[PDB]
Amino acid sequence: ADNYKNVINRTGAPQYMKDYDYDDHQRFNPFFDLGAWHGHLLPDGPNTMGGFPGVALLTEEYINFMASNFDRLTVWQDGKKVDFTLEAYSIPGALVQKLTAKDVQVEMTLRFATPRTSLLETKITSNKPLDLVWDGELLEKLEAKEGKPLSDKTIAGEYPDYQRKISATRDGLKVTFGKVRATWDLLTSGESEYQVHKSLPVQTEINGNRFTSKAHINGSTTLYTTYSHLLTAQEVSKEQMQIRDILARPAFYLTASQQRWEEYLKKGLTNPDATPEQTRVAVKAIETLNGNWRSPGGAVKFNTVTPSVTGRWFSGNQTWPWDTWKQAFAMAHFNPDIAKENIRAVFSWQIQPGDSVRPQDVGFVPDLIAWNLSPERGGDGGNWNERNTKPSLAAWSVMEVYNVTQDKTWVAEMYPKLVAYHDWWLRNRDHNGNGVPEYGATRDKAHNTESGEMLFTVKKGDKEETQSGLNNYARVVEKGQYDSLEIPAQVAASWESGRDDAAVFGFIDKEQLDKYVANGGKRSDWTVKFAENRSQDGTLLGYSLLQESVDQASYMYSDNHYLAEMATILGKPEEAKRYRQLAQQLADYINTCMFDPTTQFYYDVRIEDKPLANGCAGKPIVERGKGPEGWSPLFNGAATQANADAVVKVMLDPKEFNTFVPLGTAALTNPAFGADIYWRGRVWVDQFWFGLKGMERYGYRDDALKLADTFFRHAKGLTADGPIQENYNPLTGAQQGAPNFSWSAAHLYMLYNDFFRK
Amino acid sequence: ADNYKNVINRTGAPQYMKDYDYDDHQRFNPFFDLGAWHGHLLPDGPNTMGGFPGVALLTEEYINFMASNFDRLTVWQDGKKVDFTLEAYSIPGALVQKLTAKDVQVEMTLRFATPRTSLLETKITSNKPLDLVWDGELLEKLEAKEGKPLSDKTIAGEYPDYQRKISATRDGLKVTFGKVRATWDLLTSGESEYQVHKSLPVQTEINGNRFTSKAHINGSTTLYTTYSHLLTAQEVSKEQMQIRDILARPAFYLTASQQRWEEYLKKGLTNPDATPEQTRVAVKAIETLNGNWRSPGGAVKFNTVTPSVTGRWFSGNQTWPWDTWKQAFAMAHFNPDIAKENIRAVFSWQIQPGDSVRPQDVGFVPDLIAWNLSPERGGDGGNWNERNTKPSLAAWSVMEVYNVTQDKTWVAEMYPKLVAYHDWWLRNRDHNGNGVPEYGATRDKAHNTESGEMLFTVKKGDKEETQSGLNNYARVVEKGQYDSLEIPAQVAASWESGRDDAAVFGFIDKEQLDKYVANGGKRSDWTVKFAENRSQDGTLLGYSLLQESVDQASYMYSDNHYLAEMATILGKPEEAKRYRQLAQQLADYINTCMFDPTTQFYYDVRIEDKPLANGCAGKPIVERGKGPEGWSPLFNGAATQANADAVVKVMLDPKEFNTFVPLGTAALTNPAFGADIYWRGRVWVDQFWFGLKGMERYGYRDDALKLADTFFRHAKGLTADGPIQENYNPLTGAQQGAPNFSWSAAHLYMLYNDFFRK
Ligand SMILES: [Ca+2]
Ligand SMILES: [Ca+2]
């Protein structure tokens, strides 16, 4: 671990609870481990030297800073303060700082000991007795963006019930917090606490929101301190015995952390052809993913991994299916225990028969689960969402854990859950019943009235009229006399696709649409019709875009392929043959229906009023341009060799996808292309890797290696010490997105192992 | 009428269907009369000379231009066009233009003949034979704002089904229109037509959207032409016999129009002490109101008057109660037949027992009625609104008609309808049941769910959350952890008050609010709580602001006061005694509860959690500042002399309301004051006149006369030829609002009658 110092800049001295960057994400990168609910930063100068500033608290679903300096050590001799020089750095699994002075030296090492407690070793070297002083102060200011205050609002003024208080204890001190149910900002139980326990007797003076503690030592000695963020009264009670254990045998906990991390690196850094710089990227990915891992909390009874511990809306233990599949696929190779847990977390809330909220969605996996359940399920959580799910690469992910562990009991455990999810797609996301799914949405309070009528708002100029009923919707779409049409259910469908702004789903701005029509196209070519899915008895099951997506179909091909393998592993030959048959049928549909012989590429197809003579639901939507979904059949292995050869030529074309940073979310030729548009131009690491793997699968590994090299040389900040983000401008390589982004980290790790090299 | 040429500039050559000003109103002022559904403009120069350009069609609920030049005459002799010099002007009730040449002259007079037809007299004087040519062309461009096109969209491109078509006929030509149901822009039945009939045979050639008609005359001759905009097949059939009668006795129709207008002027201009300039303003008001008068159309079976025939959202026959009361009050003095009809139109849709939509609203008068009924009543109209009503000055208006006509049958006719409306307020707009109504909203699809749960949206940052249920609402308001709360029913309540952005109703911008709090005030001081009103058996009747408005209480005083007067006139002494008692109780409440001695003014009171010891629902809301409602008790006669004396001192204070243009919608001292804010500073003619009348009622006629003079000398454009608008900046006198605004015209006329003097 010592070979990788400061892979990510973890220094910082927060002055606001919400010390955000331009996109509302915490602008510092705290160290979290063991799935804990609090993190720490490194001192950035004389003002924070002696402690690890920026205590970051994960308040159920958000990350909020508690203080800048807190338990910062200063040393005194003969009544005079010792003058230290600072050296601070992070390593995978720990924060370290060394203070050097003539007669006194201090070496502090901070590692995590339990899912709720971090351990600080303060090794003091001194030839004479000394007086120690620790100080701390809770933050007062509420919000800032890029170092500048957004307002003069204070934490206490904004949250009168927070009522933070510092109290002395028999072996340290604790901060207590009142109950705050700020749905989108701060969530506490009224029983949460931040505790500080120490190995020596200390003298504490509390002055409101600041404190000063003193202690006298006789000479060189090593003290131990535990820091714990406990979210409930039960957690507080349970942790006490652990804290006692930690202080009694601190060496065991330091060693356990050290060995655990040596193992992550040993198991994960498996590419001997990688350069030191490329290996460092892999380590950054490992640090990022492990930092985003959260232990069980609230409604989530399993360890999980979120998109970003520092993200505005991705913190706490908020978990999404899409992210989980890629996260677990990567983590299977270095932290398999958590990879498995993350998958379990998502499936733990899979809809069961007789569900109290949506019995018509058996097998469904929620878009978002978190500490707090939605009001529909008895909680007060505002994030918990069941309006949609995400593209399914669940089987792919489960199989990867097996590839590494060869644990058949893991397959036995997950198989029935994967089958239930697989079956749900076919019942609730197959409007025309041809076995090829569509992205869509569920029946929900945000999508329809009490009686089941689909809600929608028509916008024209400054007029906004809300209506309901599929019939009325049909009439409105026909006339097309509106500037825009907002359908909550269709918005949810865009979320279900994983690319809510992609051109293929009808997203194009006025400027682009005008040019399109000016070139001979019709604005109606961009209208994606919507439909409801009802059972044979008339029961509303959900909704579907009247369009079948080629990536969706390819993921379904993958699902069947892996389910067939699992069935074989479990000794279920007949089920294996069925899935093998389902896979073949999907491959044939993908190749016959979604491949356009003329443009030599794959596209989505509309579910037209009547199917084509060949049985296809509709023709490929070539007019909306080419996108990454085009190589989904290659990545998933549904493509024929000839069609793959054709797609690869387009991918390598500099006028299409072979840009400064290759394989973006829309070809340069796409009418809705935008170099800065998230899903209509920007390059995402997952789609990029899918592309290279698809290329490799059909015999083009040499070309994939070339594109990977281009990516390594052009993707901005790759070899720097900044946090991992979400995407890149394809022309400039400039980064955008939330810092410490999990799925980017996951695919960067995959790239390191599969395509990066000297 | 000849003494008033060009009172309003009616010249113009529209080049767009929507030739709008900066606020989306048609930038020209077409001549409309007899309640017809089409209007004409005067030629602006050589380009339009020979015809009356800018055919304006009232397409059910909107005003849309059809063409610039249409049926424009040019005269030819020996193949050479006769060169004419132009003279054109409008007079009350007619448009006139004269073309002068050496040996040829043409005199054209255009007046309206029926509620669907205008008549043009073309008198040609010539010493030699001549070849006549009439030409026209339909507009092509869709929209522009003050001359600058808003896009390159064409009419046909925007409305593919409009399919305008010109066809030749044996006696002229016609333009037919396809069926267009563009709710917010253009409404046609698919059977509407614009017909041109002439007294002399002409050969018409059609070329796409343009036409040319030719005829040869042997010398001086006078021809007659009729122009008719017919909106339905039935109207088309019915008008034919009218056109025949018109062409058989053209001079009789011209005379009838002339006489009708001489009568309007004789009846209306009765102030012998007015200056020529002040009289001209009265004439402009008369022309404006008569132009906004519409004959029966669609669902409205009575003649009515709209806020503005040229308004973006006030055209067609859209009618509101608030406007109607003031419109009829003024029109009683010159066009009483239509004043009565306007009142009848509003009450024709008053809710009756057993109503199919809102049986719980018997007596209720809709906020907006128009050609097309709402979908809830079987139509496809989007304007028809029953989410709320308007302040009630219905009795006051009905009484003015009686004061002029002395027709007791009129009072007998309206009395029961007024009584029903009176009773509705007490049942559905008195949340705490103390007999003092509040402004509120009805049960509506836009306000609540099918089960009757009140809808509302909570906004925090970029997060929006639509919830339902009064209990949930109460909680949200208690926590106050939001930036804004959007409640459809409360929005409708602001519409019912007639001042949707008034300070007293909680409307204040961030800057102003931050300043208020910085000065020691509480932000919650501007929070107006809301409540539902339910009957004994639990039926939802509607909603009420938890606030009793002083103007509302004063209008209820007025209602009872005038009903008592009517009961006496109708010989119902016991009913009179009851209304007198109710009026008395309201006056006592207004004087005891809403008057604040300290600031010498009246204010709304909150309906506090518990009433005050004296029985008042709450303390006057003095902290939100003073507004025009403060003198409502004076205008309506509810104030005691002592309280009136106090209020008048504040009104005449230049640091409060006695500004450049006096008596605006918010005192200069109001914390939410804004010189350009419609309801928080701007001066409206109705509130101004209410103030002068209130002043006069309590002995201050001298001061009211002075303010009237100040208004006449300071209100911008008053003596110019521009159309009447909505309001004025109190500091500069600058105008804003829809052109040809009815209620401003109504009150300007009242000012002419009551206070304007030499
Ligand atoms: Ca399908
Ligand atoms: Ca009341």
Short mmCIF file of C-alpha atoms in Angstrom, two decimals, chain A residues 334-674:
data_model
loop_
_atom_site.label_atom_id
_atom_site.label_comp_id
_atom_site.label_asym_id
_atom_site.label_seq_id
_atom_site.Cartn_x
_atom_site.Cartn_y
_atom_site.Cartn_z
CA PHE A 334 -10.63 -7.68 -5.43
CA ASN A 335 -13.44 -7.37 -2.86
CA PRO A 336 -15.78 -10.30 -3.72
CA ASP A 337 -17.50 -10.33 -0.31
CA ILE A 338 -18.90 -6.86 -0.91
CA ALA A 339 -19.59 -7.53 -4.59
CA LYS A 340 -21.92 -10.29 -3.45
CA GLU A 341 -23.48 -8.12 -0.74
CA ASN A 342 -24.15 -5.25 -3.16
CA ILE A 343 -26.04 -7.65 -5.43
CA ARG A 344 -27.94 -9.04 -2.43
CA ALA A 345 -28.90 -5.54 -1.31
CA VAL A 346 -30.62 -4.75 -4.60
CA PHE A 347 -32.46 -8.07 -4.73
CA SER A 348 -33.42 -7.93 -1.05
CA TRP A 349 -36.21 -5.54 -2.02
CA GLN A 350 -37.26 -7.42 -5.14
CA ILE A 351 -41.07 -7.49 -5.25
CA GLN A 352 -42.59 -10.64 -3.75
CA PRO A 353 -46.04 -12.15 -4.41
CA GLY A 354 -48.69 -10.34 -2.40
CA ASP A 355 -46.60 -7.18 -2.06
CA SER A 356 -48.50 -4.46 -0.18
CA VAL A 357 -47.79 -1.74 -2.75
CA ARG A 358 -47.41 -3.32 -6.18
CA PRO A 359 -48.50 -6.98 -6.25
CA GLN A 360 -48.60 -6.68 -10.05
CA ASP A 361 -44.81 -6.26 -10.14
CA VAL A 362 -43.53 -9.58 -8.80
CA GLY A 363 -39.83 -9.89 -9.66
CA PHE A 364 -39.37 -6.13 -10.10
CA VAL A 365 -36.17 -4.58 -8.70
CA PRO A 366 -36.52 -0.96 -7.44
CA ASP A 367 -34.70 1.89 -9.19
CA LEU A 368 -33.54 3.23 -5.83
CA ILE A 369 -33.40 1.80 -2.30
CA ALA A 370 -32.00 3.62 0.72
CA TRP A 371 -32.01 3.96 4.51
CA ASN A 372 -35.56 5.33 4.53
CA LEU A 373 -38.54 3.58 2.99
CA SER A 374 -41.04 5.64 0.99
CA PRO A 375 -44.26 6.81 2.70
CA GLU A 376 -46.03 4.07 0.73
CA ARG A 377 -43.99 1.54 2.69
CA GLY A 378 -44.18 3.26 6.07
CA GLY A 379 -41.17 5.57 6.07
CA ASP A 380 -40.49 9.22 5.34
CA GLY A 381 -37.83 8.69 2.68
CA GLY A 382 -38.08 10.85 -0.42
CA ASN A 383 -35.47 9.05 -2.51
CA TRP A 384 -36.79 5.46 -2.39
CA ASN A 385 -38.17 4.98 -5.91
CA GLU A 386 -40.25 2.27 -7.59
CA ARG A 387 -41.43 4.20 -10.65
CA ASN A 388 -38.99 2.20 -12.77
CA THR A 389 -35.99 -0.12 -12.67
CA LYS A 390 -32.81 -0.14 -14.83
CA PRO A 391 -31.30 -2.11 -17.74
CA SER A 392 -30.50 -5.61 -16.55
CA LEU A 393 -26.96 -6.95 -16.53
CA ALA A 394 -27.77 -8.71 -13.26
CA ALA A 395 -26.99 -12.22 -14.53
CA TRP A 396 -23.77 -10.96 -16.12
CA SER A 397 -22.75 -9.53 -12.74
CA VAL A 398 -23.73 -12.62 -10.76
CA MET A 399 -21.81 -14.83 -13.19
CA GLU A 400 -18.65 -12.74 -12.79
CA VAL A 401 -18.61 -13.37 -9.05
CA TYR A 402 -18.88 -17.07 -9.89
CA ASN A 403 -16.06 -16.86 -12.44
CA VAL A 404 -13.84 -15.67 -9.60
CA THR A 405 -15.12 -17.72 -6.65
CA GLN A 406 -16.34 -20.87 -8.44
CA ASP A 407 -18.86 -20.98 -5.59
CA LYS A 408 -21.90 -22.95 -6.74
CA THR A 409 -23.87 -22.02 -3.61
CA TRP A 410 -23.69 -18.40 -4.80
CA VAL A 411 -25.30 -19.42 -8.08
CA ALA A 412 -27.95 -21.43 -6.22
CA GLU A 413 -28.72 -18.39 -4.05
CA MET A 414 -29.12 -15.89 -6.87
CA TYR A 415 -30.61 -18.06 -9.63
CA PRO A 416 -34.28 -17.86 -8.53
CA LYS A 417 -34.03 -14.10 -8.02
CA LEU A 418 -32.60 -13.61 -11.51
CA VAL A 419 -35.32 -15.80 -13.00
CA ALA A 420 -38.06 -13.80 -11.26
CA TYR A 421 -36.58 -10.53 -12.58
CA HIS A 422 -36.26 -12.08 -16.04
CA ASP A 423 -39.92 -13.13 -15.96
CA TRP A 424 -41.03 -9.69 -14.76
CA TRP A 425 -39.60 -8.06 -17.90
CA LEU A 426 -41.58 -10.42 -20.11
CA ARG A 427 -44.85 -9.80 -18.27
CA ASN A 428 -44.66 -6.05 -17.67
CA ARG A 429 -42.29 -4.71 -20.35
CA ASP A 430 -43.45 -6.47 -23.52
CA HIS A 431 -46.43 -4.48 -24.81
CA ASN A 432 -46.93 -6.39 -28.08
CA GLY A 433 -45.95 -9.75 -26.56
CA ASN A 434 -43.25 -10.70 -29.06
CA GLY A 435 -40.66 -11.62 -26.44
CA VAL A 436 -38.52 -8.52 -27.03
CA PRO A 437 -38.71 -6.06 -24.10
CA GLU A 438 -39.16 -2.27 -24.11
CA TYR A 439 -38.07 0.25 -21.51
CA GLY A 440 -41.03 1.57 -19.54
CA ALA A 441 -42.51 2.47 -16.17
CA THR A 442 -44.64 1.02 -13.37
CA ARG A 443 -48.09 1.98 -12.17
CA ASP A 444 -47.35 4.74 -9.65
CA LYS A 445 -48.92 7.66 -7.80
CA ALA A 446 -46.68 9.96 -9.85
CA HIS A 447 -47.77 8.34 -13.13
CA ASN A 448 -51.53 8.00 -12.79
CA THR A 449 -54.70 8.98 -10.95
CA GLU A 450 -56.32 6.83 -8.26
CA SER A 451 -58.47 5.14 -10.92
CA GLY A 452 -55.44 4.30 -13.04
CA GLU A 453 -55.64 7.07 -15.64
CA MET A 454 -52.25 8.08 -17.03
CA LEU A 455 -51.30 11.65 -16.13
CA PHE A 456 -49.67 14.13 -18.50
CA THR A 457 -49.17 17.87 -18.95
CA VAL A 458 -49.35 19.68 -22.28
CA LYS A 459 -47.22 22.80 -22.66
CA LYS A 460 -47.80 25.56 -25.21
CA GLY A 461 -46.10 28.92 -24.77
CA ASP A 462 -46.74 29.81 -21.13
CA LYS A 463 -49.86 27.64 -20.86
CA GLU A 464 -49.69 24.38 -18.89
CA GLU A 465 -52.67 22.04 -18.91
CA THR A 466 -52.63 18.77 -16.98
CA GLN A 467 -54.83 15.95 -18.26
CA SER A 468 -55.26 12.21 -17.75
CA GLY A 469 -56.32 9.22 -19.81
CA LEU A 470 -54.51 7.32 -22.55
CA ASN A 471 -57.27 8.31 -24.97
CA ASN A 472 -56.78 12.03 -24.36
CA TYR A 473 -53.03 11.51 -24.74
CA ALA A 474 -53.57 9.89 -28.14
CA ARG A 475 -55.65 12.86 -29.28
CA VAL A 476 -53.03 15.36 -28.11
CA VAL A 477 -50.13 13.56 -29.79
CA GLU A 478 -52.11 13.38 -33.02
CA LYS A 479 -52.63 17.14 -33.35
CA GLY A 480 -49.10 17.88 -32.17
CA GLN A 481 -50.15 21.44 -31.35
CA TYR A 482 -47.84 21.90 -28.38
CA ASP A 483 -44.26 22.91 -27.58
CA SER A 484 -43.69 19.94 -25.29
CA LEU A 485 -45.53 17.07 -23.63
CA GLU A 486 -44.57 15.99 -20.11
CA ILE A 487 -45.62 12.47 -19.16
CA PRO A 488 -44.29 11.38 -15.73
CA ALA A 489 -44.43 7.73 -16.77
CA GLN A 490 -42.43 8.35 -19.94
CA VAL A 491 -39.90 10.38 -17.94
CA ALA A 492 -39.51 7.33 -15.69
CA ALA A 493 -39.02 5.19 -18.80
CA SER A 494 -36.09 7.41 -19.79
CA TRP A 495 -34.65 6.73 -16.34
CA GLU A 496 -35.21 3.03 -16.86
CA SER A 497 -33.14 3.17 -20.06
CA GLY A 498 -30.18 4.52 -18.10
CA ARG A 499 -29.74 7.35 -20.63
CA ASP A 500 -32.48 9.91 -19.97
CA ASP A 501 -31.25 12.37 -22.60
CA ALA A 502 -30.28 10.05 -25.47
CA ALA A 503 -31.26 10.96 -29.04
CA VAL A 504 -32.75 7.51 -29.68
CA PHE A 505 -35.42 8.20 -27.05
CA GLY A 506 -36.58 11.39 -28.76
CA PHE A 507 -34.36 13.90 -27.00
CA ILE A 508 -33.17 16.73 -29.24
CA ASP A 509 -33.07 20.49 -28.68
CA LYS A 510 -34.91 23.11 -30.74
CA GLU A 511 -31.80 24.24 -32.63
CA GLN A 512 -30.93 20.67 -33.63
CA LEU A 513 -34.52 19.76 -34.48
CA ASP A 514 -34.93 22.82 -36.71
CA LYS A 515 -31.79 21.90 -38.64
CA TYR A 516 -33.02 18.31 -38.93
CA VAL A 517 -36.31 19.43 -40.48
CA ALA A 518 -34.40 21.86 -42.71
CA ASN A 519 -32.45 18.91 -44.12
CA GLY A 520 -35.60 17.07 -45.12
CA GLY A 521 -36.67 15.35 -41.92
CA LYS A 522 -39.96 15.68 -40.04
CA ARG A 523 -40.19 16.69 -36.39
CA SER A 524 -42.55 13.74 -35.89
CA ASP A 525 -39.59 11.42 -36.56
CA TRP A 526 -38.50 12.26 -33.02
CA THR A 527 -41.80 11.53 -31.31
CA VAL A 528 -41.63 8.39 -29.19
CA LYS A 529 -45.15 7.09 -28.63
CA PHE A 530 -46.18 5.66 -25.27
CA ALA A 531 -48.50 2.83 -24.24
CA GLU A 532 -49.94 1.11 -21.20
CA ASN A 533 -49.49 -2.57 -20.40
CA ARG A 534 -52.56 -4.36 -19.05
CA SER A 535 -53.12 -8.03 -18.20
CA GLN A 536 -55.77 -10.14 -19.92
CA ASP A 537 -58.17 -9.09 -17.16
CA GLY A 538 -57.59 -5.37 -17.66
CA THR A 539 -55.25 -4.86 -14.71
CA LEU A 540 -52.75 -2.05 -15.28
CA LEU A 541 -49.28 -3.60 -15.11
CA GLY A 542 -47.27 -0.57 -16.16
CA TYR A 543 -46.18 1.25 -19.31
CA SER A 544 -43.90 0.79 -22.32
CA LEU A 545 -42.30 3.02 -24.91
CA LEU A 546 -43.75 1.92 -28.26
CA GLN A 547 -40.16 1.17 -29.17
CA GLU A 548 -37.88 -1.82 -28.64
CA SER A 549 -34.29 -0.93 -27.75
CA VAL A 550 -31.37 -2.82 -29.26
CA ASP A 551 -29.26 -2.52 -26.10
CA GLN A 552 -32.22 -3.73 -24.01
CA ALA A 553 -32.70 -6.69 -26.38
CA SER A 554 -28.98 -7.46 -26.27
CA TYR A 555 -28.97 -7.40 -22.45
CA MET A 556 -31.92 -9.81 -22.57
CA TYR A 557 -29.87 -12.04 -24.86
CA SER A 558 -27.11 -11.88 -22.25
CA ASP A 559 -29.56 -12.61 -19.44
CA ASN A 560 -30.78 -15.79 -21.15
CA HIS A 561 -27.22 -16.85 -22.00
CA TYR A 562 -26.06 -16.59 -18.40
CA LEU A 563 -29.25 -18.07 -16.96
CA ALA A 564 -28.72 -21.07 -19.25
CA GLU A 565 -25.19 -21.52 -17.90
CA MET A 566 -26.41 -21.23 -14.31
CA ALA A 567 -29.21 -23.73 -14.95
CA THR A 568 -26.58 -26.16 -16.25
CA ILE A 569 -24.40 -25.50 -13.21
CA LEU A 570 -27.39 -26.28 -10.97
CA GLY A 571 -28.37 -29.44 -12.83
CA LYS A 572 -31.52 -28.06 -14.46
CA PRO A 573 -31.01 -29.23 -18.09
CA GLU A 574 -34.55 -28.51 -19.30
CA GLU A 575 -34.45 -24.97 -17.94
CA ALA A 576 -31.02 -24.53 -19.53
CA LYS A 577 -32.38 -25.58 -22.93
CA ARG A 578 -35.29 -23.15 -22.58
CA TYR A 579 -32.99 -20.22 -21.89
CA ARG A 580 -30.71 -21.31 -24.73
CA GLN A 581 -33.76 -21.24 -27.00
CA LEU A 582 -34.81 -17.82 -25.68
CA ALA A 583 -31.31 -16.49 -26.36
CA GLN A 584 -31.29 -17.79 -29.94
CA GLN A 585 -34.69 -16.20 -30.62
CA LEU A 586 -33.47 -12.83 -29.34
CA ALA A 587 -30.25 -13.05 -31.36
CA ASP A 588 -32.27 -13.70 -34.51
CA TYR A 589 -34.62 -10.78 -33.78
CA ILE A 590 -31.68 -8.45 -33.07
CA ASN A 591 -29.88 -9.40 -36.28
CA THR A 592 -32.94 -9.48 -38.53
CA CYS A 593 -34.80 -6.52 -37.08
CA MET A 594 -32.33 -4.07 -35.59
CA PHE A 595 -29.43 -4.26 -38.04
CA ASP A 596 -29.69 -1.84 -40.97
CA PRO A 597 -27.91 -3.31 -44.03
CA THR A 598 -27.48 0.14 -45.56
CA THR A 599 -25.79 2.09 -42.76
CA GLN A 600 -24.16 -1.11 -41.44
CA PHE A 601 -25.22 -0.41 -37.85
CA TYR A 602 -27.77 -1.44 -35.20
CA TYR A 603 -30.70 0.72 -34.06
CA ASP A 604 -33.84 0.61 -31.94
CA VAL A 605 -37.06 -0.19 -33.79
CA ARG A 606 -40.49 1.36 -33.29
CA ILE A 607 -43.43 -0.81 -32.34
CA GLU A 608 -45.37 0.25 -35.41
CA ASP A 609 -49.16 0.01 -35.74
CA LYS A 610 -48.63 -3.30 -37.53
CA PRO A 611 -45.57 -5.56 -37.58
CA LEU A 612 -43.51 -6.05 -40.73
CA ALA A 613 -43.83 -9.08 -43.01
CA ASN A 614 -40.71 -10.55 -41.41
CA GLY A 615 -42.34 -10.40 -37.99
CA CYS A 616 -40.34 -7.40 -36.78
CA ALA A 617 -42.25 -4.82 -34.72
CA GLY A 618 -40.95 -2.03 -36.92
CA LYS A 619 -38.04 -0.72 -38.98
CA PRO A 620 -34.77 0.42 -37.41
CA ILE A 621 -34.85 4.11 -36.41
CA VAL A 622 -31.90 5.12 -38.57
CA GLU A 623 -33.08 8.73 -38.86
CA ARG A 624 -32.31 9.53 -35.21
CA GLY A 625 -28.64 8.76 -35.75
CA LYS A 626 -26.13 6.26 -34.38
CA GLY A 627 -25.38 5.68 -30.71
CA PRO A 628 -23.49 3.31 -28.35
CA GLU A 629 -26.51 0.98 -28.30
CA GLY A 630 -25.26 0.15 -31.79
CA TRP A 631 -22.46 -2.03 -30.45
CA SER A 632 -24.54 -3.55 -27.67
CA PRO A 633 -25.12 -6.66 -29.83
CA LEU A 634 -21.34 -7.06 -30.09
CA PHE A 635 -20.63 -6.63 -26.39
CA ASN A 636 -23.39 -9.09 -25.49
CA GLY A 637 -22.46 -11.54 -28.25
CA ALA A 638 -25.78 -11.57 -30.11
CA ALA A 639 -24.24 -10.27 -33.35
CA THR A 640 -23.29 -12.41 -36.33
CA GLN A 641 -19.65 -12.08 -37.40
CA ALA A 642 -20.60 -10.21 -40.58
CA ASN A 643 -22.72 -7.64 -38.75
CA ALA A 644 -19.99 -7.20 -36.15
CA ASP A 645 -17.40 -6.56 -38.87
CA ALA A 646 -19.71 -3.85 -40.22
CA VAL A 647 -20.24 -2.15 -36.86
CA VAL A 648 -16.53 -2.15 -36.04
CA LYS A 649 -15.82 -0.24 -39.25
CA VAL A 650 -18.25 2.47 -38.15
CA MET A 651 -16.75 2.55 -34.66
CA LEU A 652 -13.25 3.08 -36.06
CA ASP A 653 -14.41 5.78 -38.48
CA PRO A 654 -13.07 9.22 -37.41
CA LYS A 655 -16.23 10.81 -38.83
CA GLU A 656 -18.41 8.61 -36.61
CA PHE A 657 -17.06 7.43 -33.23
CA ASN A 658 -13.27 7.44 -33.50
CA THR A 659 -12.79 10.84 -31.86
CA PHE A 660 -10.15 12.45 -29.58
CA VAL A 661 -11.69 10.32 -26.82
CA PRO A 662 -13.39 7.50 -28.82
CA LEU A 663 -16.77 5.79 -28.60
CA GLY A 664 -18.99 8.57 -27.28
CA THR A 665 -22.73 8.41 -26.60
CA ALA A 666 -23.64 9.71 -30.08
CA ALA A 667 -21.80 9.63 -33.40
CA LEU A 668 -20.51 12.95 -34.73
CA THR A 669 -23.07 12.44 -37.51
CA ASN A 670 -26.04 12.09 -35.15
CA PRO A 671 -28.46 15.01 -35.77
CA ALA A 672 -28.78 15.50 -32.01
CA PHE A 673 -25.04 15.35 -31.33
CA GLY A 674 -23.49 17.66 -28.77
#
